[PDB]
Design an enzyme around this catalytic site. Sequence first.
Site: not given
Length: 718
Positions: A1-2
């Site tokens: 995830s970012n």
Amino acid sequence: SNAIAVGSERSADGKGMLLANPHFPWNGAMRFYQMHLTIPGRLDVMGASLPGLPVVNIGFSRHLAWTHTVDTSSHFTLYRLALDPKDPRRYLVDGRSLPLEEKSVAIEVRGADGKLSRVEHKVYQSIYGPLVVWPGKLDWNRSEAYALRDANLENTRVLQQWYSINQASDVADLRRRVEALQGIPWVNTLAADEQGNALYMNQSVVPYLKPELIPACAIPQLVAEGLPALQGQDSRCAWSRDPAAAQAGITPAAQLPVLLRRDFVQNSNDSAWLTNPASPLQGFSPLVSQEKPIGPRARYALSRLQGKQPLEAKTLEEMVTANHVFSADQVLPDLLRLCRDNQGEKSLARACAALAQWDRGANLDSGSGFVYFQRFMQRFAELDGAWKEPFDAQRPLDTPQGIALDRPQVATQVRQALADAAAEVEKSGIPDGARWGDLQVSTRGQERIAIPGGDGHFGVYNAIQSVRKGDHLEVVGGTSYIQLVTFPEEGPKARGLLAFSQSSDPRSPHYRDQTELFSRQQWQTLPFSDRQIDADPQLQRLSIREGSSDMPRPTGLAADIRWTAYGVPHIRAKDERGLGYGIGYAYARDNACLLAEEIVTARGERARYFGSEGKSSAELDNLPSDIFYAWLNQPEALQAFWQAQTPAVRQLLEGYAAGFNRFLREADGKTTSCLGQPWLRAIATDDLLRLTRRLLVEGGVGQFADALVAAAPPGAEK
């Protein structure tokens, strides 16, 4: 995830801004679902949730936006047991021999002849928790065994925590609410608010060991390899108690990393360390955060975020939609020179041509040089000392870099790696001039949709993971719910997509409509205000109710539901029970079969309906999966979990079950492909508790489900 949160010192408008790019499965029990929840006057939140949960997990409100990323902290510990020399089913604590407890679970299995048979399985447990076996690494012999204590098994606060987050006003309120309850199981939290605060929190449920105990209690060989392992023959290695912690044995909130800034914070699944390199986060327990080299996604983000130029929403959007393969920045220059050094090596000609034309992207029209680059990098990773500039702790954003071509041994291995990679690419069936979008697709019924992006381990911020299936690469996970939120005068402006669309059911109008948009990378308005919702030409409205009395006055469950484009529901109610009613009904319309399947899994009933040869959506064999979830979701555990829920959460869950069941009563198949199946049935609040607990342990014992089922004491072998 970012995740990226931008504050008033770096945003182009002087206010907060948040990019949420979580990377999650495209199917199954962790498939995001968009929804907007309103109890007028006190709750108004929109974002995406996970199946069965009547709260928003990632989202925004009038003044706030927040998201999450999987963190690097440990949420369990392994305990190495010292077994009784006289008895391998007893173990020693402070030299005293203790018996293992034996818990038998009984699973029904549908056989080839359609009949059910009963299978009994023994789960051995220590004072720390169940025993686990990984053959060749964590064995159970006559000297030692391993037990696993999962910190989130006692986290009864997880649903209350997101309901509380959903009510948060700004970043300071969000921080108070998360630190107060400590209900977040295994993710970081990043957030921004309208006044321009940007917050990073590694505020999750983490086993607590006082600092003096940590070097003495660790198992050095296992910790060095990445496992949170402790000495389980010493009572001093029990998790430490601190009454400031919300839960016995977990780390108090004041000892966990937090960064509150007005420039930016970011995370792409590395530790807290370089959340913002201008203020490194250091000095935490190794169970909490370590100074480990960051991965290429975070290195990419920091390369775009550092400096003094203001950041626009468009800049953050294009960090996703550029599909830049940032790992190529480190090796492809040195690699292309090797190519120029070996012209006339026929074994390299196709590879070097493809790598030279390549746009360094994972776009739909990126050439086959991406495929060549991937197969090369899978071999480059296995070489020793091939980096020209190896990782340097005092240059942690710019190293490693380059290939050590000046050392003839590295040059030999790198050229061989490229030859082997070229051979693999050409051995596999891929047309001439095929493009990345021709290979990587998401199947929708009988048709396919080309999907851009690439694996996050290659530094593609738009991380997409795919597997070979027949002639193509089928997307299984990655970029999922996208949310980009700014705060202009009139209200929050949210932009994004649900990459795989609202519905998992091929019969639904919302099965592939956002996936077509994701393919073209065309993000959309997420309508939040009544004005935005009202402006939608696709607007549809339904009010539903059922239950007590019902008169001479309003009683019972009731919800008002509006759907905007792409089947996004906006649920309004006067209380939690009505709100849950609307959520459950709306979710069932899009995903009744998905939820029914995942409830079968969490009930430990896969083998009963589907036999022992099938798998769950987590790709566990049906019978081991059933044993694990029958052990996890025993009646006593569900009852204790229920008894610990607040009135508001109980009411949300009661409404959800009633609304889901209301849809099932009325369904005629318009959007439901599994009507008539014996596993599609009315649900109970216990079923939602089973799903919640299944999610709880995804950061802990759940990952060891196969190892728990395999754990049996030795016989009389030598």
